[PDB]
Each structure stands twice: as C-alpha cells, then as structure tokens.
Write a protein that binds this ligand. Sequence first.
Ligand code: PLX
Ligand code: HEM
Ligand code: HEM
Lengths: 106, 378, 62, 81, 51, 446
Amino acid sequence: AVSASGKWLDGIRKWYYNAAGFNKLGLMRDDTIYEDEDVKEAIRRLPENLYNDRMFRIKRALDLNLKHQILPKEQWTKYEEENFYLEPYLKEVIRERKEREEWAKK
Amino acid sequence: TPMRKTNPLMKLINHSFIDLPTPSNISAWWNFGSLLGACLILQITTGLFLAMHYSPDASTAFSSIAHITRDVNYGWIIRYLHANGASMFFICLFLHIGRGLYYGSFLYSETWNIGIILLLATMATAFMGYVLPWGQMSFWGATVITNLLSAIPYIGTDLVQWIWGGYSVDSPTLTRFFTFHFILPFIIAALATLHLLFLHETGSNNPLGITSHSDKITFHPYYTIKDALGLLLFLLSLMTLTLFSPDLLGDPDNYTLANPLNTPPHIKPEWYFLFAYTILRSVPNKLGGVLALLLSILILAMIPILHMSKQQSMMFRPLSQSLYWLLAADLLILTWIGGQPVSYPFTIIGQVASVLYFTTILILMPTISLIENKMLKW
Amino acid sequence: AAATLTSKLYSLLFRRTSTFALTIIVGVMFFERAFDQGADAIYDHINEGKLWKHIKHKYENK
Amino acid sequence: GREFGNLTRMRHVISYSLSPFEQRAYPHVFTKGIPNVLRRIRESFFRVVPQFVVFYLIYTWGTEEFERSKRKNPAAYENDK
Amino acid sequence: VTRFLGPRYRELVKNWVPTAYTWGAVGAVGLVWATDWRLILDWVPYINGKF
Amino acid sequence: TATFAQALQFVPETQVSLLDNGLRVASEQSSQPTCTVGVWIDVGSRFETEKNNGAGYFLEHLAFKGTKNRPGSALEKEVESMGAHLNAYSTREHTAYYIKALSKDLPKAVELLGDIVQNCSLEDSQIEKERDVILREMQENDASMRDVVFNYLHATAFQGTPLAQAVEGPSENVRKLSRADLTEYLSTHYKAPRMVLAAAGGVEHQQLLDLAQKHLGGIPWTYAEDAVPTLTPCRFTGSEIRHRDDALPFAHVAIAVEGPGWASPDNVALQVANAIIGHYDCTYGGGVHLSSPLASGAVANKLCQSFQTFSICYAETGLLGAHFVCDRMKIDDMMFVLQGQWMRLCTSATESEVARGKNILRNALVSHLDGTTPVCEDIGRSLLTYGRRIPLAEWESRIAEVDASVVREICSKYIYDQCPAVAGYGPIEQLPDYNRIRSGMFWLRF
Ligand SMILES: CCCCCCCCCCCCCCCCC[C@@H](O)O[C@H](CO[C@H](O)CCCCCCCCCCCCCCC)COP(=O)(O)OCC[N+](C)(C)C
Ligand code: HEM
Ligand code: HEM
C-alpha cells in the first residue's frame, strides 16, 4: 500500500527484470513460464497469430542459445514493452480448476 | 522403407540412439550423463581383469594385489585406471546431479527417483570395492562404517554381525564384499536402462527451460560426435590422472597391511564420501548421526516437492543461482573438513556447514523462489 | 434347508480379501507348528533307537 | 507418439542454411568469438566467483586458526609458566 | 495439500478404515511370523516349539 | 404454491373394483376428455413350452384382425371411425391391449375389449398370412441391434429356464403353429383373475364398473381338467455368449448380474445406484468430463459411443447391469471403467453422489407418469405383480429412506464378487475372456 516506496518497488522490479536474462533473447515474460498442464491448456486457447508469435520467439531464443550468442542491444525486450498476453487465459484455466476442485471436495 | 524401421533390434537402436529428437540447444553439461554411461563400461571391463588375479581371502588379498601391480604384465595400468576411474565416475556423477538440480530437471520425478536409487547403488559399490584392497584404511573404514548399522535401536548388533559373518571384520566379510561388489554394477546398468526408459517418453530438458518441440533434432548427426569429443576429453583427463599422478586422489596407508590390533591416525575415508562423513562427525549422537547421514542423500527426493518457482532453470533466476553456488561452496567446505582431525577450528565449522547445508535447501530456496515470483509480478 | 458351514464361512472370512489374507496368515501360523511337530514325530518314530537325542539317556541330567 | 511428424504445430517460420563444405569451420574467431566468450564470462563472474572467495577465506582462516591453537598451545604453557 | 481435507474425504477415509486396520494386522502378524519374533511368540498359546 | 408434500397428495387414489369372476377393475379419475382403456393380462412369454413358443406374440399380431362378433375389417373400420388408436404388446411376462379415445366414446371401447379378449374367429387364411408375415418380420428385426443382444443376454442368463426363450419364438416353430394350438393357448391362459381391466384418465369409475360387468363379466375363471399352469422358480447362470461377425461398425456388449425379484425393497436402492452409474450418449453436448462418471470415462480419451445402465426385473429374479456400444479397439477399456464404477459403489459411496442419485430417481419416477397411457400402463403393470398401485408419496418415503451405507450394502450384496452374465454381439476380440471379467468383479485392495 506504499506510495513512493511503491515506485521504489517499480524500480527494484525493473532492475530484477533486467537481471533476468530473457531480455537478452527477445523473450516476452510469458514465454519463460514453466509449461505444466494448466499452462498447456492455457496455450491451447491462444489466438493463432499470438500463438505463432510465441512459437517463433521461442525458436529465436533456442537458436540464439545454439550458438551461444545474444540478441542485439537495440532489439532487446524493454520492461515497458511487454504485453502480458497469457495471464487472462491462465487465470481462467486455474480458476476453472479451483472451481472443479472445490466442487470435488464437497 | 529403411531397414531400421523393420527389424526390432534396429527399431530400438533407431529409438534410443539414431533418431530420437533432442533439444538443439543442449550444452556441454548434459554430456556428463552419457559420460557416466561410458564410465560404467570401463569400470566393468577394467575391473573384470582385476578379478582374474585378486584373491578375496584376508590372508592373501594384499599379496594378490602385489601380484597384480608387479608380477602380472601391464597390471598396474589396469589397477590405476580402475581406481582413478571410480573417482572420475563420481566426479561426472556429482556434476550430473548438479546439472539436474540447476536446470530444473528434477521435475521428471520418476527419472529423478531412479537416479537416486542408482546413486545409492553406486555408493555401496564404491564402498565395498574400496574395502577389497584390504589395506589399513580399507579395513578400518569397514569397521567404522559397519558399526553405524549397529546404531539401529533394536535389531542392531545381530544385523551387524550378520553383515560381518562373524564377531569382527575378517576373511568372510571380505569375500562377501567381493561378491556384492562384483554383482552390483550390472544391477546399476539395468537401473540405468530403466532410467533412460522413463526419460525418453518426455524428452531431454533444455537449458532455457522452455519446451523445445519447435526445435527438436535427431541425435545421431550431432550429439554422437559431441559425446565423442566429451568422451575423448574424459579419457584425456583420466589418462592424465593415471599416468602422471596416480596417487594424489588416493591415500597412503592402504599399502600397509591391515592390523586388527594397531589403529591408524588420520583414518580418512576416500574423498567422495568425505562430506557425508563430516555429518557423522557433526552430530554427537550415534543414531542421530546415522539419520542425518541417510537424510544427506535422501534429501534429494524432497526437492521436487520443495520447488515453488514457476520456472525450471536457475539461469533466469539469479538469486536462486547465488544460493546454488553457496550450496556448492558449502559442499566444498564439508569435503575439505572430512580430511581433517577433530580440533576446535574444524568441529565448529563442520557443524555450521552442515546446518547451513540443510537450512539452505529446506528453507531459503523455496522462500527466495517465492520472492522471485513476486518480483516478476505473477 | 440347513445352512452349509461354507455359507457362513464365506460370509465372514472370505468376503473381503484383507480378512482372507489375514486368515491365511493365521492358518500358516498354526500349520507351521502343527505340521512341523507332526513330521518330526513321524521321522522320530520310524527310526527309534537310532537318533542320538534318544541315546542321551546314557548320559544326561547327571 | 512423439516422432517428428507428431510434434508441435507451427506456421511460416522459414529457415535458411548452408552445407558444411560450403563454409569454414572457424569463421570470425578473433573478431567475434573471443569477445563473445568474454561477455559470457563477464555475465558469470559476480554470480559465481565471490562465494568461492568466501570459501578461500574460511579455508585460510581455519588453517591459520588450527595452526595457531596447535603451536600456541605450548606457548599457552609458556604464559602459564 | 489443503484440498485433500473435506466433507467427503472424511467419509472416504472412514470407509477405508476397517481395511486399514485389517491390512495393518496382516503386516503385523506377517512380520511376527516371518521374523520368528520371540517376544510375542512366547505369549501365543500353542506356537511354542521354540525352547 | 409449489411444494412436494401437497402435490404428492393431489394425485388421485386409484379405485380397484373386484368382479365376481375375479377380474380386477381399476381406475384413476382426471379432468380431461381423453382416456385410455386396456386389459393387462398376466400371461406372458415365460409360460410357453418349446412346443408353442410363438403363440402369444402371434396372437398379439392377430388379436383383432378378425373376430366372431363382427368382421375384422369392419372392426378396424369402426375403431378408425372413432378416431381411437388401439394398440397392443406382449412382454416376456405381461400381455397387453389398450384403446386411446375420448371419454364420450368410452362405453363403445369397453365392449370392444370384451370382444377382443373373449372371442376372435381364427380363419386359417388369416393365420396363414400371419405366418409369412412373421417369417419376414424375423428377417426384419434381425438387422436391429440392442434387442438381439438382450436376447442373447437372456439365453445366457437362464438357458434351461422357461424365461430364457424369446417372445418371438424360434423361426422353425412359428411356421409350425396350428390354429388348434392357438385355441389351446387361449383356452388355457387368457382369463380372470389374471386379467385386470384398467382405465386411467377421464373415465368415471362407476361407468367403468358397469361396462366391466356387462361384457367382461362373461370371462370364465375355471381351468379345464384342473390343469393349472403354476409358475415356476428360475435359476440364474454366470455363462456367456460371444457371437462375433467382424464386419460390423461396432461391438455391442451387454453385461448383467443377478437381481432381486419385482417385489423386493432392495430394487429401490439399486435404482439409485443406476442413477450414479448414469446412462449416456455422445450426441449430447453434456459429455466430455461432465455428467456420469462412466460417461466421463466414456468421453475423455473418448471411449463409449453410447450406453445405458439397466435393471430389468421379473418375479423372483432379475438382471442388474450395463449395456454399451463400442469401437473395436476400446472394448476392454470401457469394461475396466464400468466394473470400477461398480466397485466404487461397493465400497466408497459418498453421500452427495447418493443424494444426486436420489434426486435423479425421483425426477425419473415422476416424469414417467405424465400422460394417460403411462398411468394406465402403470395401474395395470402394478396390479399384475405388486397388487395395489404403490402411491408416489410412498415412493418418495421409500427413496428418502435410502442412505449411502444402504447403497453400498445392497450393491455389495448383489454386485460384489458375483458371477457376471455376458452377451457380446460383435465385432469382438479385445473383449476380456470371462475369467478376466470374473476377476474384474472384485478388488484385491478391499
Ligand atoms: C525359484 C522360483 C520361485 C517361484 C516358486 C513357485 C512355486 C509354485 C507356487 C506358486 C504359484 C501357486 C499358485 C497359488 C494360488 C494362486 C494365487 C491367487 O490365486 O491368489 C489370488 C489372490 O492372491 C492372494 O490370495 C491375495 C492375498 C495375499 C496374501 C499375502 C500374504 C503375505 C505375503 C508376503 C510376501 C511379501 C514378500 C516378502 C519377501 C521378503 C486369489 O484369487 P481369487 O480367489 O480368484 O480372488 C480372491 C477371492 N477373495 C475375494 C476371496 C479374496
Ligand atoms: C560403477 C562401477 C564401479 C565402480 C565405481 C568401481 C570402483 C572401484 C573402486 C573405487 C575400487 C577401489 C580400488 C582402489 O582404490 O585401489 C575398485 C576395485 C575393484 N573393482 Fe571396481 N568398481 C566398479 C565396478 C566393478 C566391476 C564391474 C568389476 C568387475 C570385475 C569390478 C572389480 C573390481 C575389483 C576386483 C577391485 C579390487 C581389485 C584391486 O583393487 O586391485 N569393479 N573398484
Ligand atoms: C551411472 C549413472 C547414470 C547414468 C549412466 C545415467 C544416464 C543418463 C543418460 C544417458 C541421460 C541422457 C541425457 C543426458 O545424458 O544428459 C540421462 C539423463 C538424466 N539423468 Fe541420468 N544417469 C545416471 C545417473 C543419474 C543420477 C544420479 C541422477 C539424479 C540424481 C540422474 C538424473 C537424470 C535426469 C533428471 C535426466 C534427464 C535429463 C534432461 O531432462 O534433460 N541420472 N541419464
């Protein structure tokens, strides 16, 4: 609930965001998430163009990892640049699982 | 219609080797796994030619090895390739487990558990095999390790004498250890087949941690020569350890005959066990030291349960990476402490190192994982 | 119309496999002792005056 | 059921390549290779080394402390008398 | 882990209780016989071929 | 407004008059112009010997093609003139005839029954026509599934039992039946007190009673030579029939265990269990993991194409069980699910599922009884075995009594560790051999 200290939180989140290396590979935040079955169904529900963008950026990341190189500095993902595309879908899936479970315990 | 697809043996080789998809971006660390697969063969073949002269009687076990190192032609190279070979085996083993702990490979829980059981098997094998030469450290190590079994509260000594085959360590114990040492590695091989069996229906993990289905590639063209180079470097480091400095990973005193009467000073077990041994040195209680010992290796099974991060690899999560290298440094600390006589400086550092070794991976790692979760806004 | 003993026996012990394994184990418990002492008694009976445990009388209990 | 035809769906990601014989085994090593290895090591440093340095510190301190107590023990007999 | 507790799970565990004690009896008596445990076997009325 | 306790009571009680000849008149008042009137004779396929297996079904075909009082074409002309929809059927246990017309037309129908049952001319040309008609009908219904598979299920379950043979009778037999055999069947079966007149709907009772006496009062209640055909107890068997024929698109398996007779309490709880196992079809959008757990198994990796859980019941004996269509490759898997469901009710029966089953069962028993025909058939079929009509309030009183422990107790009593009867019309090969099924009837964990 902090104010300016919350801006400080934005600062440390930005620094930690640059501490994570996926920006070096062009990845969006959501590409990095571990793909358990909930995430699997979450990816299944993605719109085709977005799913294509995801698969291609994943290939670009793996390909850069092949030759142990790095994406050029101009092309790095920026902290404000990201679109958190997978969140609504994954939240729908997880909420559905929690609903099925809460029904299942009764 | 290739013949690989027709004949069943060529089918299975077409699966396990020639054609199975792998992530393209696999690095040098995964190679260690295959290296272990290689090491076992060496440890068999080489060892197979030591069994042809070794006599497992207590009265002649030492002189027979003198017969191998001296009288037998080219016996000493087999001796040293074998002994150093076990050390390289555990080095590749530790690096392998560290690789599996670092990149979040433990999520393949069944493969993980088979790896743990196979680990305990290799440990028992190395122990009984180290008992075989029948030197000072060999005999004494056996007495010290065996007594731990005596720790168990009710069954204890009856069970311990059941291992000894007598009141005290002697020839029958040596013969028994020769048999189990002979038999265990092949069981380790069958487990390894199970290990690869569970492994391949999901596929090998990649360093990024993201699924690599978009960039799968056949194993034969690339990783066979990559593993050829890794095996070549392995033989390089092994032959350099054997032909230039055979002894330094070993311990003098083994070249002396075992004395049931006399007792050697430093009494240090061979290096790969040392850290575990420190834990025995750390807890004053007997049974408590035994349970802490069993927890020291079992603890690996609890790791998947303790996982909290929504990612696999540490590489995108630097804080946990720092905890990881703290853990490695701590293992170096214990490994060094195992080589030292009890004294004020050592006992305090050993206890702190052990407690830190348990607390860093039962407490700090999940919590900083949660912190890494909150920092990334999900 | 009298009930067979198996009609109640099955209704009690055999109806659940856990009780089935249990009664099997107790059955082994008694059968081991009974059958062992029986076979021992028989083998002791065929060759009287041969076994040394019966020859102990020349020197036992002072 | 995870043969290459059975794998993930993916769409218009065109890829280019060359024959190994058409290209030398060690392109641009001096100009691009070494600096790459350097940025890699520079990323690795602070995340790896210092904790090992802490190991060196605890090591030297423990050795100096054991060696100190051991040889000052007769010196402890000296201040004793 | 929290999900496992619940109104029907209590019912289920209660349904499997008799089976649980029964197999527990199976493991206990089976262990006592496999080991020739002397302590309880001294107490049993007929199984006393042990001296 | 809406409530159970009153709404159960608004349903009228059914009067049951007794004629001197023993015929059982019955009725249920309502305020609608339409009413159905029928005679549910107790006679069924169970009674025939192999000598005359086809008699009841064949007479079911020519009960009203002709009659001694009026020409048959004139009769059908009359019923068609009334707008009435006369209809008939013959089950293994219960023959039945009924009419479907306005209350204004009520008397005219009643006497017609008093014709159709009491006297019907059996011209040899008509019977000779019905011969080839039935012989080709035999070629007709074979193409259909389901009924064939249940017929194998009965032939399996009973074998030497009189209940075992099909209502249609063997094709070899039907061409051999004589008119004399039919008059024999008629003289020896269709009579009071087996007969039960019933007329739920707009029918006022007293009119039904007078009309019953006037025409149905003439039926004899005395067997000739005192040759009473007493009903006999029926043995059950655990055998199986396994017809194959691999060219068919689907295997069509049906499995069944021995069940309680028509007049025992246990059936009620069993019905609830059947509500739990749940009937299903893949045409529904309600599938996927939703609906019945057996349906949730039917559609996940995609198993059962369509299935239903049934509890056929006769006097003394019955058949609990299940029935499913299947693809060739999945025939085993659907079994593994099915039996598991049984086992789940044989042990771990949670209360909420039992509650859902009770609600489904109540909804079923109420939904069945809408309309005039279902309640006439209800009064008839209920009077033929139970006596009474066993009122719906008593039904909910007996359903509310059901509890999960009762469910698991009775299901253990009839399902657990019992020998299954199996009828599988093919293609079949992956269907488990009978020992695998019999061993599939019990867990080693419990
Ligand atoms: C070197 C070669 C070694 C092998 C030697 C072979 C020797 C030949 C004999 C082996 C085979 C004989 C066959 C024995 C009968 C078959 C067993 C099977 O039929 O039992 C079934 C079930 O198997 C067992 O009966 C289940 C109970 C298991 C009891 C376990 C007792 C403790 C064993 C502990 C051993 C653990 C290993 C420890 C080693 C250290 C019963 O089937 P079924 O009757 O139709 O259904 C159950 C009916 N209910 C409802 C009444 C229960
Ligand atoms: C993973 C598998 C194995 C490992 C890690 C291993 C390890 C060892 C070790 C550490 C020693 C002690 C030698 C010394 O310190 O001087 C040893 C000795 C011995 N090994 Fe192995 N071993 C393995 C498998 C085998 C196999 C398959 C054989 C088959 C014959 C074998 C036969 C022997 C013999 C006979 C000795 C004692 C002879 C001597 O030391 O001169 N070992 N082994
Ligand atoms: C002699 C000992 C061992 C042998 C021969 C062996 C064999 C193999 C082989 C051939 C692979 C293929 C992938 C690779 O090489 O990286 C592999 C992977 C793997 N191993 Fe081992 N292994 C051994 C010990 C262990 C141990 C002790 C563990 C864990 C404590 C373990 C856990 C794993 C895991 C989790 C993988 C999956 C790799 C991935 O996900 O990418 N193994 N093993």
